[PDB]
Amino acid sequence: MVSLAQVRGALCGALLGDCMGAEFEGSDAVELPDVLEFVRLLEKEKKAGTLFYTDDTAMTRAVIQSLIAKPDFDEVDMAKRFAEEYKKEPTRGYGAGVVQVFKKLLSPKYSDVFQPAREQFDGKGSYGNGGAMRVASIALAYPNIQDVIKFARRSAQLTHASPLGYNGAILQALAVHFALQGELKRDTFLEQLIGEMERIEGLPFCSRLKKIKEFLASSNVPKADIVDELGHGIAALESVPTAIYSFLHCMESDPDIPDLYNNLQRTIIYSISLGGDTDTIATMAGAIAGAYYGMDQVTPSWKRSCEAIVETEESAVKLYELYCKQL
Ligand SMILES: Nc1ncnc2c1ncn2[C@@H]1O[C@H](COP(=O)(O)OP(=O)(O)OC[C@H]2O[C@H](O)[C@H](O)[C@@H]2O)[C@@H](O)[C@H]1O
Ligand SMILES: [Mg+2]
Ligand SMILES: [Mg+2]
């Protein structure tokens, strides 16, 4: 039985990952000591809301507003909200490509809201993680896996028309889905994901998911090896599996991370420690961790530092109602 605590956990986890990840974004070597210092300073900050969220959260909030306005899923309403949000706050840190999608939706020239995304990169569409970064809410609003899949795909295809783009969104949404279903063991969790992705792709994402299995079966896997094989890039293929690994890895102790950090905190710290697109990787791993461990692991000293923490917590209630309605 999914609880409010898990839905709120997911969203607050996504918000923390974004806000804290943003601070290290695009450094392709990050050092864990920097992350630990950052976190310690964060806990001591007397002023609340010192960390601003980025496009990841901006788009997340737009998804949520759309689901609440239109619980049956309205891709037209959603597209409009994405475009209006971009227009309202263009400097939140959007990918250079996706900006063109928003401008086409804002223009009066397109009646098919999917068409701008189809036109990206000489008709190939974006392979970026921007579809995945905002998708978690689909899993929080829709209990049935078939809904999760088709709405993850469609929400993603508003900006990401490449299969790599939108299958990454599907994968991230499935990861959050299976994290919500209670205390799944690692092996079953991955079996669940590999099962679904073979059908969906049938295989880039399955390949990476298989390597994740491999890695988890080993111990003391260098971060370099994780980055080398799974990636830490703005591409969905190189970020969504990496987020899933971070979550799965951080279900147990990491020798480098003090055990006085809880699992969700560990998850965020570890994600950021991998470098690259740290905002987006941490927001995704954080969403999965939040869903799994819930709000009890979203500590007051961490969350209070995030722009829009209050609004986010409020929004969780409305999402949770959607979820409950669907049962
Ligand atoms: N098919 C392609 N061919 C060549 N380059 C591509 C392709 N697809 C993507 N790129 C490159 O990938 C870039 C971004 O793709 P975009 O769809 O704009 O962005 P996003 O929404 O996925 O956001 C990605 C992250 O960026 C921000 O930090 C957010 O926080 C996310 O973390 C393009 O400019 C291209 O260089
Ligand atoms: Mg961002
Ligand atoms: Mg980013």
mmCIF file of C-alpha atoms and ligand atoms in Angstrom:
data_model
loop_
_atom_site.group_PDB
_atom_site.id
_atom_site.type_symbol
_atom_site.label_atom_id
_atom_site.label_comp_id
_atom_site.label_asym_id
_atom_site.label_seq_id
_atom_site.Cartn_x
_atom_site.Cartn_y
_atom_site.Cartn_z
ATOM 1 C CA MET A 1 0.000 0.000 0.000
ATOM 2 C CA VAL A 2 1.805 3.162 -1.226
ATOM 3 C CA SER A 3 1.931 5.830 1.454
ATOM 4 C CA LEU A 4 1.955 9.597 1.294
ATOM 5 C CA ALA A 5 5.395 9.378 2.953
ATOM 6 C CA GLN A 6 6.739 7.515 -0.165
ATOM 7 C CA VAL A 7 5.219 9.973 -2.664
ATOM 8 C CA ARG A 8 6.495 12.941 -0.668
ATOM 9 C CA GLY A 9 9.829 11.126 -0.250
ATOM 10 C CA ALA A 10 10.117 10.723 -4.039
ATOM 11 C CA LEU A 11 9.482 14.373 -4.840
ATOM 12 C CA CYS A 12 11.649 15.711 -1.962
ATOM 13 C CA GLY A 13 14.359 13.279 -3.049
ATOM 14 C CA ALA A 14 14.191 14.597 -6.615
ATOM 15 C CA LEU A 15 14.303 18.189 -5.362
ATOM 16 C CA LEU A 16 17.380 17.545 -3.142
ATOM 17 C CA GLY A 17 19.214 15.725 -5.915
ATOM 18 C CA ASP A 18 18.603 18.610 -8.286
ATOM 19 C CA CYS A 19 19.450 21.440 -5.775
ATOM 20 C CA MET A 20 22.551 19.695 -4.385
ATOM 21 C CA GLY A 21 23.632 18.142 -7.720
ATOM 22 C CA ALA A 22 23.426 21.515 -9.485
ATOM 23 C CA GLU A 23 26.313 22.786 -7.405
ATOM 24 C CA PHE A 24 28.724 20.241 -8.988
ATOM 25 C CA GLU A 25 27.204 20.057 -12.548
ATOM 26 C CA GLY A 26 29.491 19.471 -15.515
ATOM 27 C CA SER A 27 32.613 18.711 -13.442
ATOM 28 C CA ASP A 28 33.585 15.368 -14.936
ATOM 29 C CA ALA A 29 35.908 14.658 -11.961
ATOM 30 C CA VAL A 30 34.230 15.328 -8.598
ATOM 31 C CA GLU A 31 35.856 14.316 -5.339
ATOM 32 C CA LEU A 32 33.853 12.845 -2.478
ATOM 33 C CA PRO A 33 35.667 15.054 0.116
ATOM 34 C CA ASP A 34 34.203 18.111 -1.679
ATOM 35 C CA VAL A 35 30.695 16.604 -1.469
ATOM 36 C CA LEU A 36 31.084 15.786 2.229
ATOM 37 C CA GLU A 37 32.351 19.307 3.012
ATOM 38 C CA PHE A 38 29.474 20.727 0.983
ATOM 39 C CA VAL A 39 26.922 18.664 2.923
ATOM 40 C CA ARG A 40 28.407 19.614 6.340
ATOM 41 C CA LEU A 41 28.219 23.358 5.458
ATOM 42 C CA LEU A 42 24.731 22.815 4.199
ATOM 43 C CA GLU A 43 23.518 21.370 7.507
ATOM 44 C CA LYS A 44 24.928 24.434 9.408
ATOM 45 C CA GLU A 45 23.416 27.090 7.125
ATOM 46 C CA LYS A 46 21.145 29.336 9.228
ATOM 47 C CA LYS A 47 19.282 30.754 6.163
ATOM 48 C CA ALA A 48 16.743 28.344 4.572
ATOM 49 C CA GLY A 49 16.258 28.018 0.780
ATOM 50 C CA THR A 50 19.880 28.852 -0.185
ATOM 51 C CA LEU A 51 19.910 26.192 -2.939
ATOM 52 C CA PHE A 52 17.999 27.027 -6.145
ATOM 53 C CA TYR A 53 16.529 24.304 -8.262
ATOM 54 C CA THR A 54 17.137 23.922 -11.994
ATOM 55 C CA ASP A 55 15.242 22.912 -15.161
ATOM 56 C CA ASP A 56 14.913 19.353 -13.724
ATOM 57 C CA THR A 57 12.603 20.640 -10.980
ATOM 58 C CA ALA A 58 11.026 23.359 -13.160
ATOM 59 C CA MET A 59 9.845 20.685 -15.614
ATOM 60 C CA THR A 60 8.952 18.320 -12.739
ATOM 61 C CA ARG A 61 6.598 20.948 -11.311
ATOM 62 C CA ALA A 62 5.061 21.450 -14.769
ATOM 63 C CA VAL A 63 4.426 17.703 -15.140
ATOM 64 C CA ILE A 64 2.723 17.668 -11.737
ATOM 65 C CA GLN A 65 0.533 20.693 -12.435
ATOM 66 C CA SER A 66 -0.555 18.991 -15.692
ATOM 67 C CA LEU A 67 -1.398 15.668 -13.959
ATOM 68 C CA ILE A 68 -3.418 17.528 -11.324
ATOM 69 C CA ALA A 69 -5.289 19.709 -13.824
ATOM 70 C CA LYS A 70 -5.792 16.717 -16.200
ATOM 71 C CA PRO A 71 -5.605 13.449 -14.255
ATOM 72 C CA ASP A 72 -6.305 11.343 -17.417
ATOM 73 C CA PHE A 73 -3.093 12.692 -18.952
ATOM 74 C CA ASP A 74 -3.321 15.519 -21.488
ATOM 75 C CA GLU A 75 -0.169 15.865 -23.562
ATOM 76 C CA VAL A 76 -1.469 19.128 -25.040
ATOM 77 C CA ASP A 77 -1.967 20.716 -21.615
ATOM 78 C CA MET A 78 1.446 19.324 -20.563
ATOM 79 C CA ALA A 79 3.238 20.741 -23.631
ATOM 80 C CA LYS A 80 1.707 24.160 -23.040
ATOM 81 C CA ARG A 81 2.868 24.132 -19.413
ATOM 82 C CA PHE A 82 6.420 23.103 -20.397
ATOM 83 C CA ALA A 83 6.505 25.993 -22.927
ATOM 84 C CA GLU A 84 4.926 28.591 -20.541
ATOM 85 C CA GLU A 85 7.351 27.536 -17.725
ATOM 86 C CA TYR A 86 10.356 27.896 -20.053
ATOM 87 C CA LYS A 87 9.081 31.267 -21.089
ATOM 88 C CA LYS A 88 8.518 32.389 -17.498
ATOM 89 C CA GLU A 89 11.972 31.219 -16.316
ATOM 90 C CA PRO A 90 14.276 30.670 -19.319
ATOM 91 C CA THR A 91 17.525 30.576 -17.326
ATOM 92 C CA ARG A 92 16.829 27.566 -15.001
ATOM 93 C CA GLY A 93 19.526 25.634 -17.023
ATOM 94 C CA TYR A 94 17.773 23.913 -19.959
ATOM 95 C CA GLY A 95 19.640 21.869 -22.606
ATOM 96 C CA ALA A 96 20.625 23.953 -25.628
ATOM 97 C CA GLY A 97 18.540 21.808 -28.027
ATOM 98 C CA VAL A 98 15.331 21.605 -26.036
ATOM 99 C CA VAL A 99 15.015 25.392 -25.925
ATOM 100 C CA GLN A 100 14.037 25.223 -29.617
ATOM 101 C CA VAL A 101 11.232 22.819 -28.809
ATOM 102 C CA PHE A 102 9.769 25.274 -26.335
ATOM 103 C CA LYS A 103 10.008 28.149 -28.822
ATOM 104 C CA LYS A 104 8.227 26.129 -31.511
ATOM 105 C CA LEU A 105 5.436 25.226 -29.055
ATOM 106 C CA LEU A 106 5.205 28.940 -28.067
ATOM 107 C CA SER A 107 4.821 29.946 -31.731
ATOM 108 C CA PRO A 108 1.420 29.518 -33.486
ATOM 109 C CA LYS A 109 2.935 27.377 -36.310
ATOM 110 C CA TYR A 110 2.525 23.841 -34.799
ATOM 111 C CA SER A 111 -0.782 22.083 -34.182
ATOM 112 C CA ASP A 112 0.887 18.729 -33.378
ATOM 113 C CA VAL A 113 2.617 19.187 -29.972
ATOM 114 C CA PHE A 114 4.981 16.224 -30.742
ATOM 115 C CA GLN A 115 6.206 17.677 -34.017
ATOM 116 C CA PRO A 116 8.848 20.166 -32.679
ATOM 117 C CA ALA A 117 10.546 17.272 -30.855
ATOM 118 C CA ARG A 118 10.464 15.129 -34.037
ATOM 119 C CA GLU A 119 12.343 17.946 -35.844
ATOM 120 C CA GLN A 120 15.268 18.072 -33.341
ATOM 121 C CA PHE A 121 18.767 17.083 -34.626
ATOM 122 C CA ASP A 122 17.885 16.708 -38.327
ATOM 123 C CA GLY A 123 14.730 14.660 -37.536
ATOM 124 C CA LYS A 124 16.522 12.191 -35.205
ATOM 125 C CA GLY A 125 15.207 13.783 -31.961
ATOM 126 C CA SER A 126 17.133 14.348 -28.688
ATOM 127 C CA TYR A 127 18.918 11.439 -26.906
ATOM 128 C CA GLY A 128 19.220 13.634 -23.720
ATOM 129 C CA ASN A 129 18.054 12.803 -20.179
ATOM 130 C CA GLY A 130 15.595 15.700 -19.970
ATOM 131 C CA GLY A 131 12.673 13.373 -20.547
ATOM 132 C CA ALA A 132 13.802 11.170 -17.634
ATOM 133 C CA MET A 133 14.763 13.994 -15.282
ATOM 134 C CA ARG A 134 11.090 15.085 -14.881
ATOM 135 C CA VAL A 135 9.318 11.690 -15.267
ATOM 136 C CA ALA A 136 9.186 10.263 -11.702
ATOM 137 C CA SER A 137 5.743 11.826 -11.034
ATOM 138 C CA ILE A 138 4.172 9.575 -13.693
ATOM 139 C CA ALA A 139 5.010 6.564 -11.481
ATOM 140 C CA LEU A 140 3.638 8.468 -8.438
ATOM 141 C CA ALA A 141 0.311 9.183 -10.119
ATOM 142 C CA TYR A 142 -0.335 5.917 -11.992
ATOM 143 C CA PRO A 143 -0.352 2.558 -10.149
ATOM 144 C CA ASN A 144 -0.742 0.368 -13.275
ATOM 145 C CA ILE A 145 2.582 -0.319 -15.036
ATOM 146 C CA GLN A 146 0.991 -0.079 -18.529
ATOM 147 C CA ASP A 147 -0.068 3.535 -17.767
ATOM 148 C CA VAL A 148 3.381 4.301 -16.349
ATOM 149 C CA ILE A 149 5.029 3.070 -19.552
ATOM 150 C CA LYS A 150 2.740 4.790 -22.112
ATOM 151 C CA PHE A 151 2.598 8.112 -20.186
ATOM 152 C CA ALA A 152 6.310 8.097 -19.432
ATOM 153 C CA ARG A 153 6.878 7.631 -23.170
ATOM 154 C CA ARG A 154 4.399 10.364 -24.196
ATOM 155 C CA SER A 155 5.479 12.893 -21.535
ATOM 156 C CA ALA A 156 9.058 12.361 -22.774
ATOM 157 C CA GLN A 157 8.209 12.603 -26.500
ATOM 158 C CA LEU A 158 7.087 16.249 -26.010
ATOM 159 C CA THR A 159 10.841 17.086 -25.993
ATOM 160 C CA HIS A 160 12.662 13.800 -26.776
ATOM 161 C CA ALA A 161 11.744 11.962 -30.014
ATOM 162 C CA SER A 162 14.752 9.636 -30.143
ATOM 163 C CA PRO A 163 14.033 6.133 -28.725
ATOM 164 C CA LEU A 164 17.170 6.652 -26.544
ATOM 165 C CA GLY A 165 15.506 9.773 -25.097
ATOM 166 C CA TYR A 166 12.045 8.375 -24.401
ATOM 167 C CA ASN A 167 13.068 4.764 -23.460
ATOM 168 C CA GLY A 168 15.345 6.384 -20.839
ATOM 169 C CA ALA A 169 12.311 8.197 -19.457
ATOM 170 C CA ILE A 170 10.418 4.879 -19.413
ATOM 171 C CA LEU A 171 13.266 3.192 -17.547
ATOM 172 C CA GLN A 172 13.504 5.972 -14.933
ATOM 173 C CA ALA A 173 9.675 5.872 -14.469
ATOM 174 C CA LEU A 174 9.785 2.035 -14.095
ATOM 175 C CA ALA A 175 12.600 2.333 -11.523
ATOM 176 C CA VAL A 176 10.475 4.690 -9.443
ATOM 177 C CA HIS A 177 7.417 2.394 -9.986
ATOM 178 C CA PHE A 178 9.188 -0.726 -8.624
ATOM 179 C CA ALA A 179 10.814 1.345 -5.732
ATOM 180 C CA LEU A 180 7.292 2.302 -4.642
ATOM 181 C CA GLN A 181 6.093 -1.331 -4.378
ATOM 182 C CA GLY A 182 7.830 -1.791 -0.996
ATOM 183 C CA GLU A 183 11.101 -3.434 -0.053
ATOM 184 C CA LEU A 184 12.077 -5.155 -3.280
ATOM 185 C CA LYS A 185 15.378 -6.995 -3.003
ATOM 186 C CA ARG A 186 18.072 -5.816 -5.459
ATOM 187 C CA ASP A 187 18.052 -8.921 -7.653
ATOM 188 C CA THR A 188 14.254 -8.823 -8.142
ATOM 189 C CA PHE A 189 14.250 -5.029 -8.757
ATOM 190 C CA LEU A 190 16.762 -5.408 -11.612
ATOM 191 C CA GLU A 191 14.982 -8.518 -12.980
ATOM 192 C CA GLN A 192 11.781 -6.456 -13.015
ATOM 193 C CA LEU A 193 13.516 -3.629 -14.994
ATOM 194 C CA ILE A 194 15.398 -5.919 -17.413
ATOM 195 C CA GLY A 195 12.143 -7.855 -18.018
ATOM 196 C CA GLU A 196 10.277 -4.683 -19.026
ATOM 197 C CA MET A 197 13.089 -3.100 -21.060
ATOM 198 C CA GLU A 198 13.687 -6.245 -23.209
ATOM 199 C CA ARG A 199 10.034 -6.053 -24.273
ATOM 200 C CA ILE A 200 10.192 -2.220 -24.785
ATOM 201 C CA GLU A 201 13.508 -2.142 -26.687
ATOM 202 C CA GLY A 202 13.147 -5.632 -28.300
ATOM 203 C CA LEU A 203 19.169 -3.283 -26.731
ATOM 204 C CA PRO A 204 21.257 -0.393 -25.269
ATOM 205 C CA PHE A 205 19.428 0.018 -21.936
ATOM 206 C CA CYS A 206 19.191 -3.739 -21.280
ATOM 207 C CA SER A 207 22.952 -3.936 -21.889
ATOM 208 C CA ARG A 208 23.687 -1.284 -19.253
ATOM 209 C CA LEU A 209 21.185 -2.852 -16.840
ATOM 210 C CA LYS A 210 23.082 -6.203 -17.294
ATOM 211 C CA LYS A 211 26.403 -4.448 -16.501
ATOM 212 C CA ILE A 212 24.743 -3.039 -13.366
ATOM 213 C CA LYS A 213 23.923 -6.642 -12.327
ATOM 214 C CA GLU A 214 27.575 -7.520 -12.906
ATOM 215 C CA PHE A 215 28.877 -4.541 -10.910
ATOM 216 C CA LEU A 216 26.549 -5.185 -7.929
ATOM 217 C CA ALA A 217 27.840 -8.821 -7.917
ATOM 218 C CA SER A 218 31.384 -7.375 -7.429
ATOM 219 C CA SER A 219 32.784 -5.318 -4.529
ATOM 220 C CA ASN A 220 34.859 -2.099 -4.328
ATOM 221 C CA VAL A 221 34.092 -1.198 -7.937
ATOM 222 C CA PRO A 222 36.194 1.921 -8.715
ATOM 223 C CA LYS A 223 34.089 4.995 -9.564
ATOM 224 C CA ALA A 224 36.222 5.268 -12.727
ATOM 225 C CA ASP A 225 34.876 1.872 -13.887
ATOM 226 C CA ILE A 226 31.265 2.874 -13.180
ATOM 227 C CA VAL A 227 31.770 6.095 -15.155
ATOM 228 C CA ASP A 228 33.605 4.237 -17.939
ATOM 229 C CA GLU A 229 30.917 1.557 -18.428
ATOM 230 C CA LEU A 230 27.643 3.312 -17.438
ATOM 231 C CA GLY A 231 28.550 6.967 -18.115
ATOM 232 C CA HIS A 232 27.711 10.183 -16.283
ATOM 233 C CA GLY A 233 26.602 12.265 -19.305
ATOM 234 C CA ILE A 234 23.649 14.354 -20.424
ATOM 235 C CA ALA A 235 22.614 11.403 -22.640
ATOM 236 C CA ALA A 236 19.807 9.258 -21.214
ATOM 237 C CA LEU A 237 21.808 6.059 -21.964
ATOM 238 C CA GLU A 238 24.727 7.408 -19.901
ATOM 239 C CA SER A 239 22.731 8.807 -16.959
ATOM 240 C CA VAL A 240 19.534 6.857 -16.309
ATOM 241 C CA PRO A 241 21.297 3.477 -15.672
ATOM 242 C CA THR A 242 23.895 5.345 -13.633
ATOM 243 C CA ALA A 243 21.157 6.762 -11.357
ATOM 244 C CA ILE A 244 19.648 3.287 -10.973
ATOM 245 C CA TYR A 245 23.110 1.884 -10.059
ATOM 246 C CA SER A 246 23.620 4.665 -7.491
ATOM 247 C CA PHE A 247 20.315 3.814 -5.817
ATOM 248 C CA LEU A 248 20.997 0.042 -5.873
ATOM 249 C CA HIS A 249 24.631 0.418 -4.695
ATOM 250 C CA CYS A 250 23.592 2.707 -1.835
ATOM 251 C CA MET A 251 21.101 0.164 -0.454
ATOM 252 C CA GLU A 252 24.223 -1.005 1.445
ATOM 253 C CA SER A 253 27.219 0.630 3.115
ATOM 254 C CA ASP A 254 29.702 2.459 0.952
ATOM 255 C CA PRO A 255 33.192 2.336 2.582
ATOM 256 C CA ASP A 256 33.876 5.977 1.691
ATOM 257 C CA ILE A 257 30.649 7.407 3.057
ATOM 258 C CA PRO A 258 30.190 7.669 6.846
ATOM 259 C CA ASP A 259 27.425 5.402 8.053
ATOM 260 C CA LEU A 260 25.827 8.241 9.997
ATOM 261 C CA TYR A 261 24.318 9.313 6.625
ATOM 262 C CA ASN A 262 21.049 7.461 5.957
ATOM 263 C CA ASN A 263 20.496 5.540 2.678
ATOM 264 C CA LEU A 264 18.846 8.411 0.791
ATOM 265 C CA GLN A 265 21.634 10.834 1.849
ATOM 266 C CA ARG A 266 24.230 8.170 0.860
ATOM 267 C CA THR A 267 22.436 7.835 -2.491
ATOM 268 C CA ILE A 268 22.666 11.585 -3.220
ATOM 269 C CA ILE A 269 26.275 11.870 -1.995
ATOM 270 C CA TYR A 270 27.363 8.846 -4.059
ATOM 271 C CA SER A 271 25.507 10.095 -7.227
ATOM 272 C CA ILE A 272 27.210 13.503 -7.010
ATOM 273 C CA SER A 273 30.554 11.816 -6.319
ATOM 274 C CA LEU A 274 30.289 10.218 -9.849
ATOM 275 C CA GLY A 275 30.522 13.678 -11.506
ATOM 276 C CA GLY A 276 29.162 14.631 -14.957
ATOM 277 C CA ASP A 277 25.508 15.685 -15.045
ATOM 278 C CA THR A 278 25.334 15.568 -11.295
ATOM 279 C CA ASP A 279 22.024 17.543 -11.026
ATOM 280 C CA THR A 280 20.155 15.174 -13.273
ATOM 281 C CA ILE A 281 21.770 11.930 -12.072
ATOM 282 C CA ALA A 282 21.175 12.928 -8.427
ATOM 283 C CA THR A 283 17.597 14.048 -9.095
ATOM 284 C CA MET A 284 16.787 10.639 -10.656
ATOM 285 C CA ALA A 285 18.589 8.482 -8.056
ATOM 286 C CA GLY A 286 17.053 10.719 -5.356
ATOM 287 C CA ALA A 287 13.551 10.177 -6.738
ATOM 288 C CA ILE A 288 14.046 6.391 -6.671
ATOM 289 C CA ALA A 289 15.531 6.491 -3.151
ATOM 290 C CA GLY A 290 12.687 8.757 -1.962
ATOM 291 C CA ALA A 291 10.066 6.405 -3.281
ATOM 292 C CA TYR A 292 11.797 3.435 -1.609
ATOM 293 C CA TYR A 293 12.832 4.814 1.829
ATOM 294 C CA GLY A 294 10.223 7.575 2.063
ATOM 295 C CA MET A 295 10.105 10.916 3.793
ATOM 296 C CA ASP A 296 11.601 9.537 7.015
ATOM 297 C CA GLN A 297 14.986 9.660 5.268
ATOM 298 C CA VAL A 298 14.465 13.213 3.973
ATOM 299 C CA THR A 299 16.129 14.965 6.896
ATOM 300 C CA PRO A 300 14.987 18.445 8.008
ATOM 301 C CA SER A 301 18.526 19.926 7.843
ATOM 302 C CA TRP A 302 18.827 18.850 4.175
ATOM 303 C CA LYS A 303 15.362 19.665 2.834
ATOM 304 C CA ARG A 304 15.116 23.154 4.416
ATOM 305 C CA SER A 305 17.992 24.305 2.189
ATOM 306 C CA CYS A 306 15.945 23.689 -1.008
ATOM 307 C CA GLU A 307 14.012 26.319 -2.995
ATOM 308 C CA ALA A 308 10.331 25.324 -3.104
ATOM 309 C CA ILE A 309 10.516 22.577 -0.400
ATOM 310 C CA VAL A 310 7.130 23.668 1.000
ATOM 311 C CA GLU A 311 5.414 23.739 -2.426
ATOM 312 C CA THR A 312 6.957 20.360 -3.228
ATOM 313 C CA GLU A 313 5.641 18.769 -0.036
ATOM 314 C CA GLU A 314 2.222 20.264 -0.723
ATOM 315 C CA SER A 315 2.244 18.950 -4.288
ATOM 316 C CA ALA A 316 2.887 15.385 -3.031
ATOM 317 C CA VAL A 317 -0.535 15.353 -1.402
ATOM 318 C CA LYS A 318 -2.319 16.170 -4.708
ATOM 319 C CA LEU A 319 -0.235 13.558 -6.546
ATOM 320 C CA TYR A 320 -1.047 11.030 -3.869
ATOM 321 C CA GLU A 321 -4.771 11.727 -4.374
ATOM 322 C CA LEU A 322 -4.320 10.964 -8.104
ATOM 323 C CA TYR A 323 -2.639 7.701 -7.248
ATOM 324 C CA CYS A 324 -5.385 6.710 -4.806
ATOM 325 C CA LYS A 325 -8.106 7.684 -7.305
ATOM 326 C CA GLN A 326 -6.531 5.292 -9.861
ATOM 327 C CA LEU A 327 -6.750 2.313 -7.430
HETATM 328 N N1 LIG B 1 20.374 13.410 -31.466
HETATM 329 C C1 LIG B 1 21.370 14.212 -31.045
HETATM 330 N N2 LIG B 1 22.433 14.532 -31.811
HETATM 331 C C2 LIG B 1 23.430 15.343 -31.370
HETATM 332 N N3 LIG B 1 23.406 15.888 -30.143
HETATM 333 C C3 LIG B 1 22.390 15.632 -29.283
HETATM 334 C C4 LIG B 1 21.314 14.755 -29.687
HETATM 335 N N4 LIG B 1 20.472 14.649 -28.670
HETATM 336 C C5 LIG B 1 20.966 15.428 -27.679
HETATM 337 N N5 LIG B 1 22.107 16.002 -28.063
HETATM 338 C C6 LIG B 1 22.973 16.863 -27.258
HETATM 339 O O1 LIG B 1 22.558 16.945 -25.893
HETATM 340 C C7 LIG B 1 22.275 18.302 -25.588
HETATM 341 C C8 LIG B 1 21.110 18.374 -24.688
HETATM 342 O O2 LIG B 1 19.964 17.733 -25.217
HETATM 343 P P1 LIG B 1 18.582 18.514 -25.058
HETATM 344 O O3 LIG B 1 17.442 17.674 -25.590
HETATM 345 O O4 LIG B 1 18.765 19.954 -25.441
HETATM 346 O O5 LIG B 1 18.575 18.653 -23.423
HETATM 347 P P2 LIG B 1 17.800 17.823 -22.289
HETATM 348 O O6 LIG B 1 16.478 18.422 -21.822
HETATM 349 O O7 LIG B 1 17.932 16.381 -22.653
HETATM 350 O O8 LIG B 1 18.687 18.090 -20.956
HETATM 351 C C9 LIG B 1 19.939 17.445 -20.782
HETATM 352 C C10 LIG B 1 20.608 18.022 -19.546
HETATM 353 O O9 LIG B 1 21.058 19.385 -19.806
HETATM 354 C C11 LIG B 1 20.661 20.274 -18.752
HETATM 355 O O10 LIG B 1 21.797 20.351 -17.881
HETATM 356 C C12 LIG B 1 19.536 19.612 -17.982
HETATM 357 O O11 LIG B 1 19.607 19.829 -16.556
HETATM 358 C C13 LIG B 1 19.758 18.133 -18.301
HETATM 359 O O12 LIG B 1 20.569 17.724 -17.234
HETATM 360 C C14 LIG B 1 22.006 19.034 -26.869
HETATM 361 O O13 LIG B 1 22.237 20.483 -26.795
HETATM 362 C C15 LIG B 1 22.926 18.261 -27.803
HETATM 363 O O14 LIG B 1 24.282 18.699 -27.666
HETATM 364 MG MG MG B 2 19.372 21.042 -14.523
HETATM 365 MG MG MG B 3 21.441 18.722 -15.523
#
